[PDB]
Design a protein around this nucleic acid. Structure first.
Ligand SMILES: [Mg+2]
Ligand SMILES: [Mg+2]
Ligand SMILES: [Mg+2]
Ligand SMILES: [Mg+2]
Ligand SMILES: [Mg+2]
Ligand SMILES: [Mg+2]
Ligand SMILES: [Mg+2]
Ligand SMILES: [Mg+2]
Ligand SMILES: [Mg+2]
Ligand SMILES: [Mg+2]
Ligand SMILES: [Mg+2]
Ligand SMILES: [Mg+2]
Ligand SMILES: [Mg+2]
Ligand SMILES: [Mg+2]
Ligand SMILES: [Mg+2]
Ligand SMILES: [Mg+2]
Ligand SMILES: [Mg+2]
Ligand SMILES: [Mg+2]
Ligand SMILES: [Mg+2]
Ligand SMILES: [Mg+2]
Ligand SMILES: [Mg+2]
Ligand SMILES: [Mg+2]
Ligand SMILES: [Mg+2]
Ligand SMILES: [Zn+2]
Lengths: 135, 213, 25, 61, 101
RNA sequence: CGCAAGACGGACCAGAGCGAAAGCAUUUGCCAAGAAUGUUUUCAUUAAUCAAGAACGAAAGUCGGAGGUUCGAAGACGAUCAGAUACCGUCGUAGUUCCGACCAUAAACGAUGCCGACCGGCGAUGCGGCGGCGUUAUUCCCAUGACCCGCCGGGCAGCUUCCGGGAAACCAAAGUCUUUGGGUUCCGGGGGGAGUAUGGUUGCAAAGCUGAAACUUAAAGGAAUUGACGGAAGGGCACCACC
C-alpha cells in the first residue's frame, strides 16, 4: 500500500502548517498539493476551546498525522508555514514550533522550510474601527 | 467504512530535458471507475520545485513551477509553467536606506508562448561613501526601468521557450541589466524575480516529445 | 458636563423649540 | 536513555521564589558536550546529575 | 504646557500623513507617530534548531528567517513595555538603546 | 486549479519632497502650471498689507444617477455585570466607492498674520550652480553618471550658547520694549448667563454668519515648588513575607 521505492530514496510530501491564535492545522499533501494524505486539527485532540492553539494539541496532531502518513509510505516532508495573514497578524501562532518539533520527533525527514503567509500589496479595511479593540 | 486509499495509484513525474535531474518525485491519483478518467484528473497539476533540486550546482532561492501536460503510462510529463523567488530572499533584499526599481513586460516567444516578466533592482552604496542613503533621482529611476524593459524584451521575443528557460536558469538577464545600468546608477541584487504564463499555443504532442527527448 | 455633549444638548433643545415654535404659528 | 553529567559552573538562582538553580553541565560520555540545566535542591560545582531525558535545554537568564 | 518640542511625531513641513493600523488593537494611528519595529528572527527556536538539523535531508541546510514589520500605537507600546517613560532630561536623548554588545 | 466584482497601492517610506491651505505614493503617455538656481537680457517703481467683493476648502451630512468587496452609525441578538440600555463577540441598515448639484464646519495647530532690516557658533540634509587630488561604468579618448573634499544661494529641520527676552515652561525669536515710534490687517478687556434669546441674512434640511440684556459671583485661570496618592514604570529589604 504505497509507492515502490528503494530504501535509499525518500518519498516526499508537502506539510502545510496553519498556526493561528485559535487553532492549529497540520495538513499533508503530495508535491502538487492537490491530493490529501491526512489532515488533523488541534481541535480534534483537546475537548476544550482554550487548548486548540496550545502547543500540546499541536504536538498530538503532529504525531497523529506523522503516523498516518508513515503508514502510506511518505518519509520526508516539505514545510510550508502559514499564518492567518490578510489584514490580521503575520506572526505564526504558538503551535507551529511545537508541531514542527513533534513532526521531527516521529522520525520524519524534513525538506525545505518556506513561509507562505499571504501578504497583500494593500487590502480592504480591517475590522475594529478607528479606536481599535478596547477589550 | 471503506478505505479511500486502497483505490489510489502512484505515478512518477518527470522534468523536461532542460534540467539535469529528471525525477522530481511522485504523485497520487484515484483509479478509473469508468466515470472519471485518471488521466484527466492527473493533468493540470502544478509542482513548485527548487532549482537546487533540478540542478546540482545552482542556487536554491529560485523556484520553478512545472505543469503536467501528458501522461505516458505511469510517467507524467511536465512543462515550464512559471518561475519565482522564495519569500525570505525577497524580504532580505529590501532594505531601508536605498531605492528599489521594479519593471514588468509582456513578451511573446517565437513559438507562441506569451510571458510576463518582472524585474527588481536596488541601488548600491559606494565603497568609500560617507552618506547614509543611496537614492536615485526620478529620471535616473525611469532610465533604469526603461533599460530593464528593453533588455527583458530583446531576450525573449527573439528566442523560444527552450532558450528562455536556459537563460533563466543562471539568470543571465539580471546580470545583463545590472551591467548595462552601471553608468546611470550602480545597482546590486538585480534579478528577474517572477515569470508568469499568459497564453499557451495549441497542445502538440510532437513538441512535448522534442521537449523531453 | 463635557462641552461637546452640552453643545449637542443645546442644539437638540433649539431644534425642539423650532419644531414647536413654528413660523406659521 | 539515562545519562550522567558533571556540574561545571553554577550560574544563578531562578524560579518564582528562587527555588531552582541554573547551572552548566557537561556529559560524562562526551566531555565536549555542555548544556544549561535547572536543578532543584542544594547543588555546588562538581556534583553529578542524572538526566532521564538529556535533550531538553533551559532558557538561561 | 508642551511636553515635547516635536509634539511626539515626526511631521515636519507637511500637512497630512496617511494613517496605519496598530498590529495589536487595529487602531488608526498616523504613520509618523506610530512606533515601528523590524523583527528578524528564526522560524525554528533554539532547541528546534538542534532537533531539525539531524532530521534534515540536506547538509548544512540554512533555516529560513522570518521578517516582520510591526506598528504600535502609544497605548499598546507602553502596555507591552516595548516603550517606557523616561525622565524629563532623558526624554531628549533619542539614541537607540545599546542593543549591540 | 480557474473565473467575476469592488475597494485599496504594503515592504522601499525618512523629523525626506511638493502644494495657498485642505492635501499628495503601481507603470506609461498626453495636457497645462510652478519654486529654486544660472544670467554683463528686457521694463523702469510697475510695490506691501488689505473694507467691499471673490476662488478653493478634511471628515461627516443633504438631493438626484451608477455600483455595492471590506468595514460599519442605527438595529436585532449572545456575553459581562448588583444593574449596561457600554466597553467584548455574531450579524447588519444608511454610509464607506464613482458622476452631477448643495453644505463651508475641525485641536482646519507651529494653539505663534504678512512684508522688510540687524543681531552668535556647529554638523548634517534636499535642489541648482561653481572649484578641486583621487577611485569606479560607458572596451580607447574627452565628456557624462556613482563616490570624496570644499564654496554660494533659496528650503525642511537639529545641537549648543550668560545675544538678549519672559511669570516661568521655554524662545536665535516668543530678541533688537519705561533707552517705550519700519509698514499694515484681524482681534482681547475678571468668572458665568452664552455663542443663549431676538432681529437680519444664506440653505431643501441639518445648520452657517452677525449677535445682546436682565440676573448672579470674589474669584476663575497660567507656569513652577514641596508633599500625598495612582487598578504607572524600575530597583531594595523582611521567617511579625514567601520558598
Ligand atoms: Mg480556540
Ligand atoms: Mg474551536
Ligand atoms: Mg487598557
Ligand atoms: Mg499634563
Ligand atoms: Mg491637518
Ligand atoms: Mg513616536
Ligand atoms: Mg512650502
Ligand atoms: Mg508599491
Ligand atoms: Mg471679507
Ligand atoms: Mg467631503
Ligand atoms: Mg460623504
Ligand atoms: Mg445618493
Ligand atoms: Mg462585521
Ligand atoms: Mg472656527
Ligand atoms: Mg497639529
Ligand atoms: Mg486658531
Ligand atoms: Mg543648506
Ligand atoms: Mg527640494
Ligand atoms: Mg549639489
Ligand atoms: Mg511699546
Ligand atoms: Mg468677560
Ligand atoms: Mg501573616
Ligand atoms: Mg510555607
Ligand atoms: Zn494598539
Amino acid at each position: 500500500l504505497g509507492p515502490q521505492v528503494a530504501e535509499g530514496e525518500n518519498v516526499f510530501g508537502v506539510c502545510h502548517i496553519f498556526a493561528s491564535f485559535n487553532d492549529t492545522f497540520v495538513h499533508v499533501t503530495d508535491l502538487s498539493g492537490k491530493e490529501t494524505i491526512c489532515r488533523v486539527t488541534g481541535g480534534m485532540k483537546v475537548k476544550a476551546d482554550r487548548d486548540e492553539s496550545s502547543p500540546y494539541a499541536a504536538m498530538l496532531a503532529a504525531q497523529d498525522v506523522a503516523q498516518r502518513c508513515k503508514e502510506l509510505g511518505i518519509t520526508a516532508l516539505h514545510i510550508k508555514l502559514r499564518a492567518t495573514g490578510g489584514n490580521r497578524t503575520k506572526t505564526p501562532g504558538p503551535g507551529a514550533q511545537s508541531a514542527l518539533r513533534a513532526l521531527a520527533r516521529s522520525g520524519m525527514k524534513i525538506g525545505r522550510i518556506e513561509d507562505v503567509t499571504p501578504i497583500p500589496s494593500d487590502s480592504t479595511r480591517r475590522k475594529g474601527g478607528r479606536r481599535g479593540r478596547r477589550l | 467504512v471503506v478505505d479511500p486509499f486502497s483505490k489510489k495509484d502512484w505515478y512518477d513525474v518527470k522534468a523536461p530535458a532542460m534540467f539535469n535531474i529528471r525525477n522530481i518525485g511522485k504523485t497520487l491519483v484515484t483509479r478509473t471507475q469508468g466515470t472519471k478518467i485518471a488521466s484527466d484528473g492527473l493533468k493540470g497539476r502544478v509542482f513548485e520545485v527548487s532549482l537546487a533540486d533540478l540542478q546540482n550546482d545552482e542556487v536554491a532561492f529560485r523556484k520553478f513551477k512545472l505543469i503536467t501536460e501528458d501522461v505516458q503510462g505511469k510517467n507524467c510529463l511536465t512543462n515550464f509553467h512559471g518561475m519565482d523567488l522564495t519569500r525570505d530572499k525577497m524580504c532580505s533584499m529590501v532594505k531601508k536606506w536605498q531605492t528599489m526599481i521594479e519593471a514588468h513586460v509582456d513578451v511573446k516567444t517565437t513559438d507562441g508562448y506569451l510571458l510576463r516578466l518582472f524585474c527588481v533592482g536596488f541601488t548600491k552604496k559606494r565603497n568609500n561613501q560617507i552618506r547614509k542613503t543611496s537614492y536615485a533621482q526620478h529620471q535616473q529611476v525611469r532610465q533604469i526601468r526603461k533599460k530593464m524593459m528593453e533588455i527583458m524584451t530583446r531576450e525573449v521575443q527573439t528566442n523560444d521557450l527552450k532558450e528562455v528557460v536556459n537563460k533563466l536558469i543562471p539568470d543571465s538577464i539580471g546580470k545583463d541589466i545590472e551591467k548595462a545600468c552601471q553608468s546611470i546608477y550602480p545597482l546590486h541584487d538585480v534579478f528577474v524575480r517572477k515569470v508568469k504564463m499568459l497564453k499557451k499555443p495549441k497542445f502538440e504532442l510532437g513538441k512535448l516529445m522534442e521537449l523531453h527527448g | 458636563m463635557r462641552a461637546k455633549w452640552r453643545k449637542k444638548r443645546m442644539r437638540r433643545l433649539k431644534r425642539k423649540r423650532r419644531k414647536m415654535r413654528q413660523r406659521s404659528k | 536513555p539515562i545519562k550522567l553529567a558533571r556540574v561545571t559552573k553554577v550560574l544563578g538562582r531562578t524560579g518564582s521564589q528562587g527555588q531552582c538553580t541554573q547551572v552548566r553541565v557537561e556529559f560524562m560520555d562526551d566531555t565536549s558536550r555542555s548544556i544549561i540545566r535547572n536543578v532543584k535542591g542544594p547543588v555546588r560545582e562538581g556534583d553529578v546529575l542524572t538526566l532521564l531525558e538529556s535533550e531538553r535545554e533551559a532558557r538561561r537568564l | 504646557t508642551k511636553k515635547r518640542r516635536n509634539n511626539g511625531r515626526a511631521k515636519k513641513g507637511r500637512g497630512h500623513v496617511q494613517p496605519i493600523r496598530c498590529t495589536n488593537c487595529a487602531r488608526c494611528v498616523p504613520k509618523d507617530k506610530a512606533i515601528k519595529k523590524f523583527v528578524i528572527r528564526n522560524i525554528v527556536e533554539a532547541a528546534a534548531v538542534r532537533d531539525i538539523s539531524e532530521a534534515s535531508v540536506f547538509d548544512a541546510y540554512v533555516l529560513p528567517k522570518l521578517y516582520v514589520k510591526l506598528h504600535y500605537c502609544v497605548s499598546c507600546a507602553i502596555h507591552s513595555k516595548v516603550v517606557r517613560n523616561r525622565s524629563r532630561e532623558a526624554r531628549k536623548d533619542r539614541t537607540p538603546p545599546p542593543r549591540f554588545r
